[PDB]
Amino acid sequence: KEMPQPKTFGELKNLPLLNTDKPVQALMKIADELGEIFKFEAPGRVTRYLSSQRLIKEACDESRFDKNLSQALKFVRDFAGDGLFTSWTHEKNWKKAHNILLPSFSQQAMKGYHAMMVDIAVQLVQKWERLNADEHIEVPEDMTRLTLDTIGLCGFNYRFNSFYRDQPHPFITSMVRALDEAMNKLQRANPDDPAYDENKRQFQEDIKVMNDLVDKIIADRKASGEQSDDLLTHMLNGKDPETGEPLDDENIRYQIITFLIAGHETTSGLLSFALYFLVKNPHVLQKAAEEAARVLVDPVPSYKQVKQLKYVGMVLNEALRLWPTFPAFSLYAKEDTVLGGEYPLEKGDELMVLIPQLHRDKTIWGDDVEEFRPERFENPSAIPQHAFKPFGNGQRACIGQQFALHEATLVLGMMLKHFDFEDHTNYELDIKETLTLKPEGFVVKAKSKKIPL
Amino acid sequence: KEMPQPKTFGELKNLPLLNTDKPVQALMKIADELGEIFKFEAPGRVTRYLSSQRLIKEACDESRFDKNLSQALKFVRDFAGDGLFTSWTHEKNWKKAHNILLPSFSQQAMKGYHAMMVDIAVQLVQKWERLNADEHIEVPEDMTRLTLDTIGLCGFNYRFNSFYRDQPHPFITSMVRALDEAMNKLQRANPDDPAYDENKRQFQEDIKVMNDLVDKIIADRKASGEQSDDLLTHMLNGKDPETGEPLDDENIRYQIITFLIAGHETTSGLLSFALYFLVKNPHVLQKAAEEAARVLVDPVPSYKQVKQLKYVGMVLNEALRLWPTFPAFSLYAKEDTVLGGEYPLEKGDELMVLIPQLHRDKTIWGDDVEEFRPERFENPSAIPQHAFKPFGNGQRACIGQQFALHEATLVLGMMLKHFDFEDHTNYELDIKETLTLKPEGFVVKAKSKKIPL
Ligand code: HEM
Ligand code: HEM
Ligand SMILES: O=C(O)[C@H](Cc1c[nH]c2ccccc12)NC(=O)C(F)(F)C(F)(F)C(F)(F)C(F)(F)C(F)(F)C(F)(F)F
Numbered sequence: 001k002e003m004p005q006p007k008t009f010g011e012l013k014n015l016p017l018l019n020t021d022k023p024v025q026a027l028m029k030i031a032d033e034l035g036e037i038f039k040f041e042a043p044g045r046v047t048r049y050l051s052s053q054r055l056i057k058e059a060c061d062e063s064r065f066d067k068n069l070s071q072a073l074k075f076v077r078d079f080a081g082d083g084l085f086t087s088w089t090h091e092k093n094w095k096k097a098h099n100i101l102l103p104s105f106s107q108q109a110m111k112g113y114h115a116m117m118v119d120i121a122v123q124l125v126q127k128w129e130r131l132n133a134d135e136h137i138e139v140p141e142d143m144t145r146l147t148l149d150t151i152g153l154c155g156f157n158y159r160f161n162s163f164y165r166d167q168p169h170p171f172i173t174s175m176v177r178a179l180d181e182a183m184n185k186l187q188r189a190n191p192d193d194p195a196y197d198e199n200k201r202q203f204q205e206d207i208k209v210m211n212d213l214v215d216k217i218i219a220d221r222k223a224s225g226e227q228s229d230d231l232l233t234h235m236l237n238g239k240d241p242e243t244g245e246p247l248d249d250e251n252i253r254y255q256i257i258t259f260l261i262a263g264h265e266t267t268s269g270l271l272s273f274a275l276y277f278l279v280k281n282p283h284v285l286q287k288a289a290e291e292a293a294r295v296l297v298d299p300v301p302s303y304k305q306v307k308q309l310k311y312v313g314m315v316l317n318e319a320l321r322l323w324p325t326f327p328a329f330s331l332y333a334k335e336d337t338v339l340g341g342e343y344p345l346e347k348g349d350e351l352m353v354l355i356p357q358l359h360r361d362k363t364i365w366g367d368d369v370e371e372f373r374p375e376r377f378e379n380p381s382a383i384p385q386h387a388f389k390p391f392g393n394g395q396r397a398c399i400g401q402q403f404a405l406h407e408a409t410l411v412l413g414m415m416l417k418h419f420d421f422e423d424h425t426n427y428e429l430d431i432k433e434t435l436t437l438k439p440e441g442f443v444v445k446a447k448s449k450k451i452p453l
Numbered sequence: 454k455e456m457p458q459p460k461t462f463g464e465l466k467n468l469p470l471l472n473t474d475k476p477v478q479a480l481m482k483i484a485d486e487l488g489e490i491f492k493f494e495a496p497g498r499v500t501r502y503l504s505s506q507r508l509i510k511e512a513c514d515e516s517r518f519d520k521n522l523s524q525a526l527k528f529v530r531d532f533a534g535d536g537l538f539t540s541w542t543h544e545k546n547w548k549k550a551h552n553i554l555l556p557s558f559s560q561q562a563m564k565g566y567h568a569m570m571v572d573i574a575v576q577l578v579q580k581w582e583r584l585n586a587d588e589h590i591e592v593p594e595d596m597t598r599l600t601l602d603t604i605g606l607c608g609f610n611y612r613f614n615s616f617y618r619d620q621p622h623p624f625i626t627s628m629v630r631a632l633d634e635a636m637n638k639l640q641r642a643n644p645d646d647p648a649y650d651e652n653k654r655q656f657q658e659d660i661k662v663m664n665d666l667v668d669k670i671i672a673d674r675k676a677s678g679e680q681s682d683d684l685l686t687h688m689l690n691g692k693d694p695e696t697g698e699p700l701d702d703e704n705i706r707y708q709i710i711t712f713l714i715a716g717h718e719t720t721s722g723l724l725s726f727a728l729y730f731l732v733k734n735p736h737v738l739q740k741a742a743e744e745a746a747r748v749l750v751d752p753v754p755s756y757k758q759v760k761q762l763k764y765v766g767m768v769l770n771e772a773l774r775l776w777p778t779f780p781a782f783s784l785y786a787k788e789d790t791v792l793g794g795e796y797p798l799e800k801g802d803e804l805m806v807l808i809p810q811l812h813r814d815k816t817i818w819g820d821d822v823e824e825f826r827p828e829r830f831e832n833p834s835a836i837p838q839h840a841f842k843p844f845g846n847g848q849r850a851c852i853g854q855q856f857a858l859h860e861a862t863l864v865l866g867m868m869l870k871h872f873d874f875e876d877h878t879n880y881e882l883d884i885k886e887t888l889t890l891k892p893e894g895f896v897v898k899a900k901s902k903k904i905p906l
Contacts, residue, residue, distance in 0.1 A: 128614050133673065159583050166619050
């Protein structure tokens with residue numbers, strides 16, 4: 001159709017547009033200007049950004065499109081390896097690990113993780129109970145402490161003890177710096193230029209630090225013989241029904257690194273955005289707090305009680321609507337095909353699904369798309385197909401969805417039961433972009449309702 | 454016959470002997486060489502160090518000798534003011550505060566503080582329970598986190614939240630640096646030399662940090678009118694029966710600063726030395742652990758149970774015997790008098806009581822003074838008057854004695870109930886001197902007995 005394309009910079013084509021610390025937000029504005037589809041070129045490379053439910057519903061057809069590793073994911077793959085998130089669907093270790101780990105991530109398995117989630121959630125509540133009169137909370141910082149700890153504990157019985165520290169754990173320093181370097185590689189003609197030798201040296205170091213530390217966690221567990229009901233145990237013992245094979249220790253390492261990435265990056269952002277919207281929308285906070293008080297009648301919340309926090313669940317979905325914390329996923333055409341009746345694609349052609357824009361499609365949600373209204377999610381059946389994709393699509397959808405939502409619902413429920421919140425700075429949303437999105441500098445004050453634990 | 458005296462440095466006399474990281478330990482070595490008394494001279498001053506029970510019992514006759522402010526304490530007074538610890542006996546505010554505060558520090562008052570002591574103690578135990586299998590504990594660091602927080606919470610319902618951070622609370626950074634400066638001023642021949650301009654700027658800044666926080670806490674409490682179970686409440690409401698006056702806000706601040714200093718410095722040291730002696734003497738550890746397990750039958754220890762920890766109390770007293778954490782106190786002759794039928798003293802003459810040396814007086818304790826044997830304290834009746842003085846003397850004895858011993862007995866009891874301990878490094882005692890003595894670099898491993906809290 002003579003596809004729309006944003007401004008170009010001679011031989012660099014569109015690449016300079018991503019030379020910014022907020023590339024996703026830049027892409028969202030481009031989508032606002034250009035519409036449901038735009039081409040994005042750089043030297044030697046092209047992708048097409050999709051923003052409408054009309055086109056994205058075709059992109060979600062697994063017979064036509066499969067998951068692609070974006071350039072960022074190809075760089076994350078240098079340390080996340082062939083774990084689930086950075087593997088191609090056709091790689092043997094993808095379907096093997098997928099089949100082995102699904103049972104570990106089901107709604108049923110959440111019952112088993114619940115106690116350990118409560119352990120970390122209570123540490124959060126206690127921290128906040130123990131703050132003095134005039135003190136405030138650094139929201140994304142504390143949400144990250146929580147979610148990292150939760151996956152460490154539930155994942156491999158390891159306590160990061162984030163609420164005991166200011167300094168991040170050695171693994172995290174390397175992980176964050178690796179993630180940063182992976183995103184920075186996306187703006188470099190001549191990667192072999194000696195000006196990046198220190199960047200490369202640091203990256204290799206960081207890779208080796210994560211490996212050495214995770215490999216030791218594996219080794220120690222094999223050595224102890226302990227059978228704690230966690231992801232590491234299920235990976236050590238599990239066999240893929242198809243091949244009959246277990247995961248090898250290298251792949252297990254990559255899965256653990258992957259889970260730590262997820263638990264540090266994604267769920268913490270969700271909790272941070274949810275709290276942000278609640279303090280910006282007092283009527284919604286009140287309704288959520290009402291439910292929390294009504295449902296969480298015991299000092300320790302139970303698994304069943306978390307399932308009964310329906311409005312808290314809707315609040316989280318609405319937070320995921322506006323700011324899906326992993327904001328884009330990539331696809332490639334399995335064969336030649338035509339998108340939307342108008343855009344012919346060849347086998348191998350790539351697409352990027354711009355999730356925050358999909359979630360702002362006024363044809364789907366109505367004109368009030370920027371408003372925070374959890375009630376939009378009262379009935380999944382009234383939401384059109386492929387309109388809401390915060391956890392991606394199909395067989396390559398987020399394996400951690402049930403875990404993330406259970407943790408987030410539990411913690412947000414507890415938070416709303418135990419405290420009233422003040423937006424004491426009238427915080428202005430400022431979204432930092434790493435692998436994920438987070439509200440940087442978001443702070444609040446929390447006044448205890450003095451309900452015992 | 455002339456009074457013994459250590460080596461001299463020309464015009465500086467004995468002063469350079471205290472130009473060392475470990476002055477008290479240097480003075481103990483000198484005492485060992487020279488005996489029960491030696492003179493120590495510096496430019497413009499003289500003092501006499503006493504090591505024997507026979508001379509010290511006379512020095513402790515309050516009709517003949519009163520508390521002196523050592524050079525060190527005069528410098529500490531720049532921030533502790535006319536608080537109890539740094540006031541002269543004849544100053545109006547000493548007796549006034551003493552009368553008001555004595556009931557707040559009694560054995561009976563410990564019933565009121567017990568619950569908040571437990572609050573912090575449980576945080577210590579949770580921290581250690583949450584360590585990963587082969588991580589270790591930094592003993593004085595964690596004991597200092599505990600004792601500071603306990604006196605903060607019991608003293609003025611303020612949470613330093615030391616177990617939530619690596620870097621000390623700003624107030625503590627200032628207090629430590631002020632205490633360090635106060636000790637450092639002692640060696641400067643020309644204090645107004647421009648080389649100390651920064652030291653003095655920093656000292657004043659540190660004093661202001663301390664005054665600001667404390668004055669604010671006092672102001673906030675008076676504004677709100679709330680009534681807590683803390684020393685601050687008692688000081689705001691208390692009246693001295695003698696003068697009929699309450700303490701004013703400035704003196705209240707000095708008392709609070711004083712209590713914070715004491716909690717940070719002294720009790721933490723006692724706990725660290727006790728654990729040191731315990732891991733070096735496993736028979737004693739076993740005997741103390743048996744008592745802890747037998748007595749502390751509830752997840753939350755009670756006041757009544759802490760009082761039953763007789764042997765844990767003996768352990769603490771024997772640790773105080775070998776390493777009394779505030780190791781020296783100073784006296785002055787009220788009038789002309791003769792010490793020991795041998796050494797004439799003029800009115801105003803200063804004496805220093807070397808407590809560690811008193812506690813090694815073989816004429817009182819037997820020849821095995823260096824051995825750690827809590828059974829020495831099996832029957833308190835046996836201990837001669839003035840043989841054991843870790844809490845000083847008479848009306849100027851430590852007002853916090855019952856507080857310190859309650860906290861230490863509680864915490865050590867809980868530690869011995871909940872963990873086994875390993876001296877994994879075969880630690881060599883290395884004693885750091887600030888205001889007090891503490892074992893620097895003492896580390897252990899603690900293996901949980903998995904007893905619920
Ligand atoms: C609010 C929280 C989370 C969000 C928004 C989120 C989002 C996503 C999205 C959008 C994808 C698809 C990526 C793509 O198509 O390239 C994905 C994949 C994945 N997520 Fe998450 N995620 C979250 C939490 C978690 C957690 C807690 C874990 C693990 C403990 C996890 C593990 C994974 C894995 C392993 C994949 C790859 C699955 C596969 O392809 O087989 N996620 N996630
Ligand atoms: C094991 C712990 C402790 C030891 C070994 C200890 C030792 C001492 C000693 C030896 C003195 C006499 C000082 C002198 O003669 O110049 C003293 C005085 C004092 N201590 Fe402690 N102390 C401890 C804990 C505490 C605590 C926890 C507090 C307060 C919370 C405290 C508050 C004081 C005060 C206010 C004085 C001055 C008393 C007065 O002269 O009226 N001490 N301490
Ligand atoms: O890594 C990629 O392949 C694509 C597109 C791209 C990056 N460089 C290009 C050069 C030519 C053509 C396309 C590109 N990168 C992006 O869209 C982006 F801007 F970096 C991005 F939006 F931040 C992102 F990386 F895709 C993303 F949205 F943040 C993400 F994929 F969700 C993330 F995983 F978070 F990185």
